[PDB]
Symmetry: D3
Subunit: 337 residues, 6 copies
Amino acid sequence: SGLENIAFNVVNKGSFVSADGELPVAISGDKVFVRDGNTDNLVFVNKTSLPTNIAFELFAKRKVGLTPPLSILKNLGVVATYKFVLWDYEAERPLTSFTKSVCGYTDFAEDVCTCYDNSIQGSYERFTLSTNAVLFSATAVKAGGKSLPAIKLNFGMLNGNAIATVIKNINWFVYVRKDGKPVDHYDGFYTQGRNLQDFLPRSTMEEDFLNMDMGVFIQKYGLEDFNFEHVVYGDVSKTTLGGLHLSISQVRLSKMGILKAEEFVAASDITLKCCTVTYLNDPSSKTVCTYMDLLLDDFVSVLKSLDLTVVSKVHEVIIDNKPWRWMLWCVATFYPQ
Amino acid sequence: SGLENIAFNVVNKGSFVSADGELPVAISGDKVFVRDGNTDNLVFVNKTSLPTNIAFELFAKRKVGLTPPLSILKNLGVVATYKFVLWDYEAERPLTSFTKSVCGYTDFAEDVCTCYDNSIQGSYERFTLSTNAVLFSATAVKAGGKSLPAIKLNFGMLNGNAIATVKSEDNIKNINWFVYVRKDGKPVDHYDGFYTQGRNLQDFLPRSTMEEDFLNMDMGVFIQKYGLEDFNFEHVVYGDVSKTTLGGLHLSISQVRLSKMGILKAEEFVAASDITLKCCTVTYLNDPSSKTVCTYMDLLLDDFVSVLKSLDLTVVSKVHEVIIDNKPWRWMLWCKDNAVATFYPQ
Amino acid sequence: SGLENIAFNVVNKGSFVSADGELPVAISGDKVFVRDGNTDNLVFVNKTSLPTNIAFELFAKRKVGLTPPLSILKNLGVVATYKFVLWDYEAERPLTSFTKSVCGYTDFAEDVCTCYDNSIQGSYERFTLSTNAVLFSATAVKAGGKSLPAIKLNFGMLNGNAIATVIKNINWFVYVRKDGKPVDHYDGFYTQGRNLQDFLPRSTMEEDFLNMDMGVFIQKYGLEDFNFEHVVYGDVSKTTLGGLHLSISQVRLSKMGILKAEEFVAASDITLKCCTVTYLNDPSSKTVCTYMDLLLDDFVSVLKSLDLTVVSKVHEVIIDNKPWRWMLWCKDNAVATFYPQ
Amino acid sequence: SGLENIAFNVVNKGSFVSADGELPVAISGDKVFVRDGNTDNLVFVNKTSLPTNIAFELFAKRKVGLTPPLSILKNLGVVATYKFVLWDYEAERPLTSFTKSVCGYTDFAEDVCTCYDNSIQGSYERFTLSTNAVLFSATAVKAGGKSLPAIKLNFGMLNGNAIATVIKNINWFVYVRKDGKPVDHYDGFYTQGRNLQDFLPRSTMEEDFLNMDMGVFIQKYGLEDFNFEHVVYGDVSKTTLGGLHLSISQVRLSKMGILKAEEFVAASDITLKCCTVTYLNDPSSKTVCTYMDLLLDDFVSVLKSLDLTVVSKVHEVIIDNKPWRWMLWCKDNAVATFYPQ
Amino acid sequence: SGLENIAFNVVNKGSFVSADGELPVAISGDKVFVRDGNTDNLVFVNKTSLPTNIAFELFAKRKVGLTPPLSILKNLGVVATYKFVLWDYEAERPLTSFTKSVCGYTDFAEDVCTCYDNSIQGSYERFTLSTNAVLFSATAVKAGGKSLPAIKLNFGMLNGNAIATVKDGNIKNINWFVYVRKDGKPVDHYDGFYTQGRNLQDFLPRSTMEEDFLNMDMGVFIQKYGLEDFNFEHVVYGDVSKTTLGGLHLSISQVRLSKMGILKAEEFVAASDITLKCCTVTYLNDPSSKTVCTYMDLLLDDFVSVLKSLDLTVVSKVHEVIIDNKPWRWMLWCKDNAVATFYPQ
Amino acid sequence: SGLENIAFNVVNKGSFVSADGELPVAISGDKVFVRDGNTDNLVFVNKTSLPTNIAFELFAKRKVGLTPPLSILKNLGVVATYKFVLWDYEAERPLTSFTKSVCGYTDFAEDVCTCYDNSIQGSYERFTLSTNAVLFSATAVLPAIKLNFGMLNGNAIATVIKNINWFVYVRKDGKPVDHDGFYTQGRNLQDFLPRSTMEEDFLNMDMGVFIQKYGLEDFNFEHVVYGDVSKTTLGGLHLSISQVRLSKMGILKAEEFVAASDITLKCCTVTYLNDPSSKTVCTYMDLLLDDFVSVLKSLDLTVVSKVHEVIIDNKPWRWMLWCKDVATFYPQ
């Protein structure tokens, strides 16, 4: 019911819970202070292009706890969100510049592609009545009796941290509507949204990839055909650095010594990452390294779709519901863009 | 209801009236924006050392309309105000950095000299029970029929502009303020001295007959009329452009009369409505002349003259102490021929 | 082709002419500097909530020279502008937060109500294909060689200044299209966009209003039944002012003495203005003073549309294509008070 | 003697030592630069609500090296500090907005509650003449001839880092005065001031709690009545984290997997801390997790003070010289749930 | 005591006099505050690209009172300035951004063209020994009894305000003398005309011709000074009759037009160091606009002098007239033994 | 050809490659945003005193990948650089306030000491034509500065099979030079790697074994280098590698007064948490351990008090010496 109120909620509850109360608030440049006793504590720092007080409010009104991965929602063309805001924790910014019934400043009028949270009363109804829109739910929408064509997710984010199923089940179901018309498209591959430091294997294959030597691993999974000498492992034997087009391959290399990734831009909503990687111990490096995080199993399966029977070609493979062009030689070198 | 409510009030009522409503607010740098439709408007720019949003709130909670002159309140040592802020429109800041029961951020717990508005409920009580305090009132505090001793003002400020009692000619208009002081759990027995009129160079209007004649009459006629021959206004007051360094220009009114006959520029080192003794660089273009440090105050010409007649002109050098805005001020006197050579402050 | 190109244009031409060249540009806080020789010159100071470099660019790409009044277009609900931006010189910002084919950062892909300039090639066509749009032109738009229905204006803005037809002819024609269809009805009056300092009278009445002793004016123009000595002229003999609901009333007063006016928000796109007014010489004030800048002629027109036999009537009068609630009080078959909001 | 002097001190000696010299200084926004040769170096970034140059000065004049823990002082009502500032290396600001004889801008004179350093000459004398004051010292104050009641601490901070007596002896004695009279006695427990990453055991019980399985440990210290598993150890078994109401329990948990804690507000002067804890390996979050850092020995001797014969209870426990409420749900001859707030 | 000391000087004496004292100072954004009692007063606002505390100091170290015109100094290639700064009061920035022995932050090592004030000890020595440099003086350098070649100005600025030599007795003499050194030796020749410092608002006539120009109906003026062969009703006086304005290439043209009605002029970049001004002019009462209007402040006498030196036969020619020690291109068109257009650039 | 062009390059290629095309750019305070779709991503945060947009430009035009150590180049008096920019990744500012043919705003007309890159055409020529100047090359050219180490994308790197070298040449007052000390390796506490088998031993070996093996018994390491937590005041830690070994045994915290990659003699406040001690000032260097030892054996045992001058990164440094006849060694 005001900035001071928002501050109170955040200082105490960590987010905006609608709780009643107020704290004195100072806005200096990109910083937000709240006065406690005789001194001011800095509760927020603005990383966005929005007015600080506003960016603060949006962050307070963010969806808290378990949340859907942002990368897909970005690709789906989402513009405004309804009665809530998705926070990109890496980028330290909201997923959108636009909002519906959240913040008087960011609130938006004209009809536009809009994301709906199914845990919010009356959202789903508004979804079906929308020409263009997206909806996500913890549970599969029933019409009628079994399921709807959807996007199924065994993973997601918890308080901004990459999370996934293990006995805990994490599930997301995404639905899409274009030009008045629902869609059955929905395929085939999705990024796991894991970072370098906190990376944990989500599969038994990934469990093995980090531990086993290249030979025993390759032999085990029958990857002998595909050449990992260059790609998917990476080679410091050369001054210019081979492979590392998977988030997971970098993780293995950082176990063998000091690996530094500096991304050009950083966001959790980006499907295809681009960084500059440097390996210190045997000093190779890659000025432009294009990578993305895939469940290794999902990646191998996309290798199965290939052949040694062409010299070169573009395969576009479908990830986060976009075409992504990968370039190939023969198997010798493989990589996106 | 907070910032967005304050914004609503200011945009609509011009100040904070405790009206109900909200406008979305943006804070960028020193600027306060309200969003009306598809565009943002600029309602405030921060001239203070406070957080932009706080300065804005303090400004909205400022006393509006008729207000007392700020200089006397400063000279009385007011640290904080109770349930109001006084805005210095010259300085574009509050009279104080501290408040009681106004803003959560600037509210101050510790015991200080506090100013009280007698127009506000509960103030007189807090004041008479206060060890050190100041109180101002638009009507005289009276123990029956007989007025308690006070600082008595026939002038004041209106929305940041200097006003005063006037006849209206072709019908009176009375501006009055009354100011009461408490030091060490006791009232003060008497108030004396002179008060500065708070006028500025552009908007200056004469508040007396003498001040009217000063701006109109040629120097001879004026001096002749008021019997001023011994004080030699020709230097001390009027100011002299004949030389390359300016004459006195020690009164606000001196600069006004001079700016009628040519181009006069005055740059103040610091500008505030609460400063009783002001300092500027003065420049007169038409007959180029300058004063790098020009110390002036705005005094009713009648009061300044009054002071002169209190002077012993037989003396060679003398340092006179003159009470203005309830403070002692130091003024240098040099005489010859039993007439004034120089009379200036500091 | 960039910030440096734009700076070159502004510093030289005073606007973006698409002319070729570059100057070194420094952005510090809300200030924009061009480096000339060994020193940096201050060019733009940013009064907007937009990024300092964007506000500069939009200011550079603003329509220069003669421009249409901003008030109406704001009321017509314009979200965006096509191949140009309109500058509000009072507000020191654009009329809109959005543009179409102007600036990459502010360019908006979706469907919103858009203002179109006819002088700009390609615009009229896009105007008629738009579901909701506005368009303005310096010349009438004819279908059958006979003019289309339009908002017709004898005045406007020149380089952020208020000018009028006066041998000098200034004309604007405004056309709206809402919900797939044009609009056949424009009724109302319009605000002249003048301000207190630069105010010039645009009629014979106005000239007379300013020069003539009131009551001679009251007589010659036959307003006796009207309250003007209160409702218009304004009354300084009381601690509270009254009247001053027209710009021109303040203008006549500022001539009589020292009149100060602080607007709560300043914009050239605002129809109904609000400010605190103060008069020093016979001290008087109005804390909330709502005012217009209507042609005095247009105001008198409204006064004669009134039923003076009433007690309290709230009239809705059309100004700048919007209804505006006005409170009338009558006494002895004369106006007691007439004011807005 | 001036901003440029202060910068000379900081760039060379790390703090303000009163050394003579000057360096050219640039204040841009929240940043402070010194010019060394042809380039500017960034000395300081301003995290405070204070003007950048003032925060830089206060940071320079901060008490350096061995310092008292800030939580007690904050809680004790401390307003101004006298001839020193205390820096909070977490919050990156001073313990106070006000000072006495330190910085001309922050220097404030009207009597208030003032903290005094005994290593600073003249202070004790000023402490005893103060109506409301606080004194701290590295050595006990005697009189007459024996001792004085005090808050005694075996731990402190060193250059913003948590340290305890461990062959090194670390001691602080804090004294208080209200209403012209000394403070009769001091009670309660004290937070250790440690943090999740830099945590070190201050006691043998703490060492064991970290290195031992439950029930080897619980058996050894005979805590069986108090139910530790759900109340302390922070079982991740469920979707909502349990336990984690002590720093040390969050430390033991971060050994077994990835534990994230986002604090709403960071300060080293804060007694009762509140964050959002996340555990990735077997996912669980406590959206609001209120915790303290208490010597585990001090926590247990709190538990033994409890009455386990009651069902619903609110216990008031004194920590850092303030009462704090904990809820005791204990059911039968044991503890069901014990948590603060 | 640096910043706090400088502040004490500005708040009290108006500039830095090397008085002793300290005031607590707060730098917030582009603003400089001093604490007086319980409140901060705002003493400075930074319009420069320099750090705020630095621009405050350079301003305090500005030359105060009577100062030389900054246009010539800029044109002469001045880069740094020795033991003083010159403040441009219009642009609210220094003339330089580089200093020699002024401010530790702004101070410069490498050899560059430097300006010297002759009232400052050590200055003339360094100037005569400089390979490139400029000197200015309130008094002529003379040897002996006879004055070396210089730039003689009877006008100048006073506290940022344009003043000039002026006259009931009443002579106030304003004089500046400028000396240049390029490539290890003096320049022997100074020619051309000089712009005054005047602005539209504070403008004052410096000659009888200018007084008459302002007070006289055109053609009474034109008759009196015999200007008929020149276009003055256009190309000087300026013409509100059409949509595009025209004329107004002199500061004094705008001034005269400014007293006949409402005239607005908005400069593209404002400075006191600029010889050739460029703005956008608008006349409200008879609506007219010159979108790009280039003009100068020239003694009307000096301009009339340029006109009479023109060849009135030739159809079109580019003229070069030297103003503020730089060549400026003026375009000429002659109709029949008379001016058609005469304009800068 | 502009800011929007630069942004395009940076977001895509990581630096300015001259590639064509543009992206929408927002400048707020010290932050630089590029608009991508419906959101603005934050590309750059300005740590310099330069205009935000300029600093961003200089960062983009920086030399990328393999670079020379800046310590030397600072000391040689380098003022402007020619058609390139050297970035200090620790200070997050460039090496100079000036440039020659790089950025229109930072570009400088007057003649000054100028560093040249020899992988840039027309450089060596302009270098030899220059009154005072500096040149660095990936290959030799003659008297030089031989460096088997350097920086890679802002990381301290060096030779081990991977060979990396740098050659530096100087001119002063219209003539070449003859140059000649040791050089700092530019490593940092966290990312430290031993570049010499001796250092490899220093970290991994207990003290006595180390001192006996390399025969350092005379001058006691247990004080001067290894560092000693015993006293309330730390002591030792005048080397980078000395702090790296201490951080192995517990919690070590250093706070530098000023952080730069171009700095030779480092300074900072050091603290050991596990067995508390602090050094308030602690000036220190990163020297190849072998090269520091070679300094010790140029020393006189027989003097009670001696002030030694040593050349590190082409600069004289005052080192303090007392002997037990061996006792105390440390700078400034």
